[PDB]
Amino acid sequence: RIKNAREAHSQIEKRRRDKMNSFIDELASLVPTCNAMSRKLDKLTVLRMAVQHMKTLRGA
């Protein structure tokens, strides 16, 4: 009966994962080294490249 409830929960959970992934992709599109890439980079690298990129900016 409340099996529906568990699937509801697990769906909420997938919605969040999917949102984070799209944000990760969108972030990568905004970091030139990632953008310039044929193979998609993994999520940790994208994050590392994004903070690297930000430290790059403050130096003007």
Partner: protein
């Protein structure tokens, strides 16, 4: 007696999850602001906003 591999794999997975959180916290500590706690998605979302915004302003400042 395969607990050893499972356990090791759990350790490995946890390390990625933790590196990921560490990276998020660092992105957030870098944003113009700022008032935690943003959740992970918010950090990401606000990081995106910041770069588009910096792009716009920075471009505008010439031609």
């Amino acid at each position: 007696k395969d607990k050893a591999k499972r356990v090791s794999r759990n350790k490995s997975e946890k390390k990625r999850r933790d590196q990921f959180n560490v990276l998020i916290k660092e992105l957030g500590s870098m944003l113009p602001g700022n008032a935690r706690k943003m959740d992970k998605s918010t950090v990401l979302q606000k990081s995106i906003d910041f770069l588009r915004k910096h792009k716009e302003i920075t471009a505008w400042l010439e031609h």
